[PDB]
Design a protein around this ligand. Structure first.
Ligand SMILES: [Ca+2]
Ligand SMILES: [Ca+2]
Lengths: 511, 512, 511, 512
């Protein structure tokens, strides 16, 4: 059974209930040395699964449909989330920017790999299917399927480590073509950082041409397996509570290892085959890399709306918000929050036509978001840590402490909010702040924001390459060349400026 | 004679020639212990004056007029720089953004107080004249005047220091204060500091016991108006250097002066706020100028960053270090900062809101963001340049005189070539241009200017916070946090879609 | 029964066994809404208690005694840890510096509030007992007791928050004298950030003179209670393993709220009584503030030895240590690690005589350590996070994954060390790094290092005040004043320099 | 005539007068397209020459001799600066540290290439002469010479740029290379860049196909030795300023030149390494100099930070902002950085280790730490100053000529007073001193110098890592991590004092 067959109607994406039923497919997932029977009921994934299901439910609410949905461009007569359909103007991109922000607000910016992230990949297939040559019809069909059903795609792109001392064994670790058959291709290898793949329907995977592949793999195919990292949702449930870990308990996106063990990929799922030329050209010509950072920038901007107000609430509680230096530190967090919204505005207003009527967001703004976000996030976290100087480190252990009157009587007296809040509300706000930055979930989120789109050198190199490839550097260079042409070793070459022959005193001085 | 009377036509702003003639008035400027006889010929100001004159000439050039000008809204049938006329849409602001960029490119982003800077003040007077009460007609007339003529306004806003040990009488006399009220106007005395490029301006706007609660326009040639100049990088570059050695110092120096007002008569036609503490306190928020000028400043910086970015790339091509991954990454970060200020200027226009009388204001959050980011970005970009041109800047031959002496030149031709194939003349020229941008006294002054531009580091951050609070932005962010908090309590979830931990919590079994 | 009565001998401090027995005293501690019966057996404290007991055991090992111990100066004929006795030379301080480093190495620098931290307070009482006036004999007796027994002292100094809108109620939150009796004083209030107080014997607590107090409070006195924060030791035990959380499982120092509810403090335990003059003078004259940062700097330097080598091991595993930029980032961590050792060298070599033959470490070096440590620690953590770009975020969940052959077979193939390490060793190293920086314990440690001795402005202000009070600023100022005296508005005032009258061209130019 | 023959006595180093006479030789220096006739009288070098002469005079002053000098170890019965004689204990290094600080205080930390900088090279030759093989006696004789006379040595180590597009023949001719071997010595050609203060030195040490594998001593007056100077901040300050306006530029400028060697004859007595790639590669690690000079550099910077710290405090007293908590915190951080470099110099001496022939070397880890921290600390301190003197530096009156003109001076007396009660003359003087330290072209050059001092940011960090590895420090840190790892495995603790989690782990009960 195909995931899309769980829908009661072919004219709309999944509802939350249909999405949850579609995950009960015998996918192979491991956590804590055991196989997961059902992701929708398992204590490590059930609330994250319920959080994603809320996004699907919002598409069917009349009050949210103007902001979230458009009709499909397929002629099916149905509707879809705006970011699942190819943008054909700067205004289309702005409407998609707002639809992404509306979905991101349902997780307060904490879910980074929701269905709209890879919906940009579906749009890349639909806008430029001709790029894939003999696999053009696969690109067209996959765009149609993703758009109409609201299929939850992810990607597994980071390669696993290689032992430099191994013999043959080295060329077996990476995703490699092992056999070509009539039904399709047989593949083996692994990809790391398969973020929230336990809750997805499909994963896109991308001098020996056997390594030059791009294909779609279903989460329930024989040989497809996930090896999970520690679950902050399960730990928060087993040893904490929603009051103590309000983000860990519902928004944890498990960063897994995606294993492919002798997996048959049907020809209908192949996009690039034994083609080093198309693989090298895909980052620049495919469209996806020129589209997804719009989603990521908006998602971060929503998370920064949350962090900014949460920091203000935390400082109202500590009473340090009265200090000039504290207000200045909060003001800088506000400036960073404003930056990411302004970048998303520029991404849309400066959008350019691409191919087949499609529009792409401003490429310089996408690269800028990638460079600034790790620095802004690390700086904002340091600002929070140095401003809530004492308030976070000694928080009572549990909601159980508030529910024990022998303990609660002291918390009511000694842990009140400076701005008049009762102890229950003060502790609640500070626990929410701690889960955002210092819990294992908070620590993982920092590592995620810093390393998301690559190393610090790599993101800066790609920002430079974009300025060069777009012609931006040539235009900046033309201005410097003009400045240089206006003078030489003999003086000005322009008539409006005064030469120094009448005022230079060096001949008279050095005579 | 009024400065506008130097124009041969009432249908356009000054040409460069007319602007230069208008500066040959009774202005009283001191530098190096001497009174300046004529700013347009004096070795400390002549090239900076010639650089501003080029901006005026560009307004009348067919190849530039399309990007720079619009017709006046006064019914005169004339034209003006787009930023001298009130914006009435988001598209109007984008056109003004482009017109500012075109003028800023004529100085490669190095002149920060050109006439378009205070043209936002003229627009503030025109958009909201009713704010000034009995002085409403002065606001209307000044808007008309500035717009049609392209008058070069400036301001001196920073108060001078006060000795805390002097009597209460002596400390009060230092600030701008009303001395006497007459039939012709008001008599004022005091001083303002950081009167950047006031030597080349027509008028200065001066603003904040009601005798201290004033806002007025003062001509640069009024009796009792005097400027005490700082050291001239233009004059030093001319006397001991050359355009080759100091290519920016020699033409774009904007002298940061002390503006003195010694018993100056201000006619009633030039008064905007009079003995009114309420209007003075309300002006930053309601006047409009503070909500307009950072659009000019952000664009000006973005143009300077276009210049610095490519100049850094050229310098690294010469040193040959551009082949290193870490060097390319450092240049990539400069590119990201350059991109940021352009993206902020895009948002300022696209997110513009209606104000009063059909006027539009740029996005206020984006103006505050530019003010906070610019000092950090500029200091970081300068550090990136310093640590990447590790040797190339410090030993540059002294002078174009070294290149013009064959005995010295023959060794420079052999040992100081560009790594990318440039001859020594071009290699030294590029690196001297980079040094003038960052390490010369002009380069050092520019860093101090970009860092301290719109106030202290705490003040700019406080104003960014105040804007989020006053606009309702903080209330909306707070509504999202309040919604998160309402979804659970000390007993569990308050929303039905999430699973409570009663079936998995192990603390009862573990404890007791 | 007194803690010291648990020792089988009066001529040596506690052994580990005797220290553990001494904690079974009916102290009142809460965690997870429940009373703790015994800290030595409770799942939230038992390993942290066992870790402290190892320090006591090391004092009795012949192989460690040259580095750890000296004879007492009390005439008892016994021995003690070197830092529990007053230093009387620069060499004494250097020997105490080495003894602190030896004890700190037993927790790899992760235990910040071990008995040697407050041993500096015992030494402050012994070096200057005359400061306490009528309480001089209490200072002498407490120094003797702490030194001979190796009593585990802590301090509770951070005040709890105050609700600005409360009426009377405001002046009840802080530690305040409520009654003066023949036996002693009655006190009430609370102190926050009582780090590892669950494992201590005593805590030192320090216009209305009822608030101007300094006294010693036993952990088992009626009305003395601790309200604990979440236990990373218990969470690591319940949902993890030593392999998964190797630091959280044995070095967690619980940051508690210390409550004093109508506590009788006997006159023998009072050090400063209703004396605003002595309270204000104590930071500058007491000695403790001029002593404890030697312990803290050494402790951090040991933690940086650990982090530096752990980062190198982690980069060997990822294989990125081959990159120039990665080696430079590691080199900076090395430079920070070297700084804190160099500061501890200067603290000892530049030591000055104080009172009664006692020596104090260099005060400028103590203030410098306090300013630099938050910046260095935040920077080192950012270096680690941006250099282990992928390796930390997807680590398999558990030692249970390695013990399941179905999962282990893929980890053996795809998660090997780049430098030839097997997957078990690669995962182990990276989990150790993650527990140091990203676990909740790692997050708490960052908050601790940043905020330890106060806000960022406060530590910088105290560094400035030290330069001014010591005469250092006056000497730097004398050099600037000399530079200024060498010229005036007319030229040089010194004869060796050439005036510019023969070369100044301004008269000729401006004529 | 040899430079040492200018001394009236063989029992002491040069006096200031004798040092100045020794510079009036055949040295060939160019500046501003002209050959310098006499460095001691030329307007670009005369005060820098006079500043170095004061250091030599201080060696013979009773009030300073106690801190600066020791007897020679040569048996001559004379004395020398402590840093010119091989250290044979940790206490010897502390005494040399203090002698360096005393000399550095005479320039307030602004002269970075004074004679004590390369005196560490003389000590490297004396401590390990056997390293040089057949040139061992040259090493011994040069140590004796440098120590007894106080010869001013320097080095030019940075190679000049090479055009990558030139033929393999042309690119090779650029670097220092052996041209011919004769009976008298060797003929060399090539160039070195960043020859800081070479115009005022006696000899330069020049070091790294075996023709390129050389180390030798070259006198500044040898035929074919030429300097091409950078712009002179001393001359510019003299021609267009005054000591009041530029108090550091006017006396402490160390010109960063290009050192050219055109068919120079180097006598065999001056050769140290000849056509030996093995000795050239080993010299950084085994020579001793690289393990000695950073003690001088760290002390010199620490003295400059004593100056900057108090100068910042004086400047903030004048602006009156020192009353603000955030301003006091910013000054407190500058104090912490100043304290760091002194603490590093203490550790360099107390942790000194024995080397060869009884010689001691400062702690190597502390030298590498100083190199990594100094560029970050200096850039941060400069940013702190710039953002805290928000207005005070940018508008300073142009000249002492303004104070000497009563018409201008009367307004400065009223409007430019110090907030702490200082008169305008003292307020402007302090702020001009601060500006010359950070924003003048001299201040800009000093920032570039401190940042790029001992190499690129990656290179200094790599050398810090290599030192931890080569010394065994990394192995010892690794032994601690290996011990932590050995205390547990995938089955639990391997140590008996800790409790395993079998009784509390809830995963079996929770899963399956
Ligand atoms: Ca006049
Ligand atoms: Ca000669």
């Amino acid at each position: 059974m195909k995931p899309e067959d769980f829908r009661a109607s072919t004219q709309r994406p999944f509802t939350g209930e249909e999405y949850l039923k579609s995950l009960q497919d015998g996918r192979e997932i491991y956590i804590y040395g055991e196989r997961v029977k059902d992701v929708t009921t398992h204590p490590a994934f059930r609330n994250a699964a319920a959080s994603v299901a809320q996004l699907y439910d919002a598409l069917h609410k009349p009050e949210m449909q103007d902001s979230l949905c458009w009709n499909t461009d397929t002629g099916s007569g149905g509707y879809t989330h705006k970011f699942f359909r190819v943008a054909k103007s700067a205004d289309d991109l702005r409407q998609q920017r707002d639809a992404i922000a509306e979905w991101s607000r349902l997780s307060y910016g904490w879910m980074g790999r929701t269905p709209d992230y890879k919906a940009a990949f579906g749009c890349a297939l639909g806008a430029n299917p001709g790029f894939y040559g003999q696999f053009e019809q696969n690109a067209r069909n996959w765009y149609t399927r993703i758009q109409e059903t609201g299929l939850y795609f992810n990607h597994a792109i980071v390669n696993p480590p290689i032992d430099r001392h191994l013999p043959d064994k080295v060329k077996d670790v990476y995703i490699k073509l092992e056999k070509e058959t009539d039904a399709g291709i047989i593949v083996s290898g692994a990809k790391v950082v398969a973020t929230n793949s336990a809750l997805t329907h499909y994963n896109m995977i991308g001098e020996n041409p056997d390594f030059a592949l791009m294909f779609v793999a279903p989460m329930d195919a024989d040989g497809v397996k996930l090896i999970s990292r520690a679950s902050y949702e399960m730990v928060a449930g087993a040893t904490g509570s929603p009051y103590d870990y309000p983000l860990s308990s519902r928004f944890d996106e498990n960063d897994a290892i995606l294993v492919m063990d002798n997996v048959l990929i049907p020809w209908e799922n192949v996009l690039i085959y034994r083609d080093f030329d198309r693989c090298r050209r895909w980052t620049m010509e495919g469209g996806f890399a020129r589209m997804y950072p719009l989603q990521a920038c908006v998602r971060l901007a929503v998370k920064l709306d949350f962090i900014t107000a949460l920091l203000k609430k935390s400082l109202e509680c500590t009473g340090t918000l009265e200090f000039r230096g504290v207000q200045a530190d909060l003001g800088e967090v506000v400036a960073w929050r404003n930056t990411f919204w302004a970048l998303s505005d520029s991404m849309c207003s400066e959008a350019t036509p691409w191919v087949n009527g499609a529009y792409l967001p401003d490429h310089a703004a996408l690269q800028t978001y990638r460079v600034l976000a790790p620095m802004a996030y690390a700086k904002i976290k340091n600002i929070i840590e140095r401003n809530v100087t004492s308030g976070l480190i000694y928080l009572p252990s549990s909601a159980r402490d508030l529910n024990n009157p022998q303990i609660d009587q002291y918390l009511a007296k000694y842990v009140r909010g400076s701005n008049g809040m009762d102890h229950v509300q003060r502790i609640k706000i500070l626990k929410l702040m701690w889960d955002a930055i210092g819990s294992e979930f908070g620590g993982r989120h920092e590592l995620y924001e810093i390393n998301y789109s690559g190393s610090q050198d790599e993101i800066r190199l790609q920002c430079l390459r974009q300025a060069q490839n777009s012609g931006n550097m040539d235009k900046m260079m033309a201005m410097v060349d003009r400045c240089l042409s206006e003078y030489d070793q003999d003086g000005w070459t322009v008539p409006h400026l005064h030469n120094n022959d009448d005022i230079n005193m060096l001949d008279k001085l050095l005579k």
